[PDB]
Design a protein around this nucleic acid. Structure first.
Ligand SMILES: Nc1ncnc2c1ncn2[C@H]1C[C@H](O)[C@@H](COP(=O)(O)NP(=O)(O)OP(=O)(O)O)O1
Ligand SMILES: [Mg+2]
Ligand SMILES: [Mg+2]
Length: 430
DNA sequence: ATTGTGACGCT
DNA sequence: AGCGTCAC
């Protein structure tokens, strides 16, 4: 009752770019706009691998991971843009730079946590208080929320999508208690107003559209964001959680999409997030550990404490290449040449990072995968990163991995290498 | 023959 | 440190 905290202390948003790499390519090439199109990596094997899909193409069943030749079977008019290739490998620089455009705009409004190349969490608690005191008890007009959905509404006692959106928004705004600067629902609503402004700024200043979730924590904000993609934002209130979670598959919640979530389902014999409420905290800790158990106990009630971390920049800079099937590396000169290619791309990125961000990486991580290993990475080893020099970095990487060659003759490499990876980490101010 | 990333937990 | 999980 009076002492059960409800996880309503913060306003958190998650902003996620719509079909991001496609929008980057559509901005550059107007011929691709408003078309079924996808972004592909490589081309020789089965037309290349799709990594991003416009919503028009999704209507035909085109998905990420699909080979372009197969996507063309579903959508013969599908347009394609290829990822740039440099030093024999896909190079993601255009999309990293477009990401920086977006992240810098978001940072004007509040502290952000860069969660991926196309999404960031925003802690809007302080901006909301500021806007509430600036408002001074004035009601919030539906005109300030032109792309907002209120999850769970309309309910209780039109057949077009926009009409239903507005009905739900009207119900929400009519029930709002604007006199209380401490009402969590009012705080979320003001947060949604700010996120409308943020998303309008992103679109105006970059051309890119995005979706967003607004709630009281990161997990609910991320879940909310997906409910009404594309080009829309969704408010998930604390009160909306019991109905929303009552039919929400456990795998849809961030961090439960893999083996842990499958074990929750298997061990407890449940399917939906809401069913977790019927277990004690101790029961959940007994099955999934102290940390996971406490997290699940609170999360299924809509409560999570994970902070929005003040971090706009990636904390590692990595370069990797797969060598699948018959292309696996089997000679010493091959391994050396590709380590050099990776190191040269890495040195380029690291030198730019040092100039832009006043920091230097101090550790080099070298990872490989050998033919036959089902795991993604076979061995990882670190060494010192003291100079941004590609030849030195590639020589050091080879020195670190050379004992992995089981071949008697040095000139060959056994077993063949199906992946190389160089990662710069452990950044220090400079 | 997904690929190229990137954050964080465990021991 | 080196390995595993999870999601982009
Ligand atoms: N498995 C993968 N491998 C490589 N690149 C990937 C990838 N998954 C995504 N990307 C790249 C390409 C993606 O554009 C970008 C952001 O990933 P999302 O936010 O998961 N997906 P998007 O923004 O395309 O669509 P929407 O958010 O509207 O559903 O990261
Ligand atoms: Mg996205
Ligand atoms: Mg994303």
């Amino acid at each position: 009752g009076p002492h059960m905290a409800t996880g309503q202390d913060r306003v958190v948003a998650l902003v996620d770019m719509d079909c991001f790499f496609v929008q980057v390519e559509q901005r550059q090439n107007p011929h691709l706009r408003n078309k079924p199109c996808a972004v592909v990596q490589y081309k020789s094997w089965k037309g290349g691998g799709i990594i991003a899909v416009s919503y028009e193409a999704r209507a035909f069943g085109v998905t990420r991971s699909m080979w372009a030749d197969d996507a063309k079977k579903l959508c013969p008019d599908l347009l394609l843009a290829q990822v740039r290739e440099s030093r024999g490998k896909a190079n993601l620089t255009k999309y990293r730079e477009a990401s920086v455009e977006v992240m810098e705009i978001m940072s004007r409004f509040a502290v952000i946590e860069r969660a991926s190349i196309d999404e960031a969490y925003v802690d809007l608690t302080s901006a909301v208080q500021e806007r509430l005191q600036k408002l001074q008890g004035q009601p919030i007009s539906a005109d300030l929320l032109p792309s907002t959905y209120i999850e769970g509404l309309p309910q209780g006692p039109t057949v077009q999508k926009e009409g239903m959106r507005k009905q739900g928004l009207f119900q929400w705004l009519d029930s709002l208690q604007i006199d209380n600067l401490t009402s969590p629902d009012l705080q979320l609503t003001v947060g949604a107003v700010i996120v409308e402004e943020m998303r309008a700024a992103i679109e105006r200043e970059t051309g890119f559209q995005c979706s967003a979730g607004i709630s009281h924590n990161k997990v609910l904000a991320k879940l909310a964001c997906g409910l009404n993609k594309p080009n829309r934002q969704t408010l998930v209130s604390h009160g909306s959680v019991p109905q929303l979670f009552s039919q929400m598959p456990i795998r849809k919640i961030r961090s439960l999409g893999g083996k842990l979530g499958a074990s929750v389902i298997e061990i407890l014999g449940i399917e939906y997030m809401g069913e977790l409420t019927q277990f004690t905290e101790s029961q959940l800790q007994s099955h999934f550990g102290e940390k996971n158990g406490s997290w699940l106990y609170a999360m299924c009630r809509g409560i999570e404490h994970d902070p929005v971390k003040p971090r706009q920049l990636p904390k590692t800079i990595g370069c990797s290449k797969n060598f699948p099937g018959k292309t696996a590396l089997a000679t010493r000169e091959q391994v050396q040449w590709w380590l050099l290619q990776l190191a040269q791309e890495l040195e380029e990125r690291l030198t730019k990072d040092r100039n832009d961000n006043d920091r230097v990486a101090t550790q080099l991580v070298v990872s490989i995968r050998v033919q036959g290993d089902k795991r993604l990475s076979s061995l990882r080893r670190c060494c010192a990163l003291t100079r941004y020099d590609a030849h030195k970095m590639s020589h050091d990487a080879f020195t670190v991995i050379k004992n992995c060659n089981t071949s008697g003759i040095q000139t060959e490499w056994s077993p063949p290498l199906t992946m190389l990876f160089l990662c710069a980490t452990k950044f220090s101010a400079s």
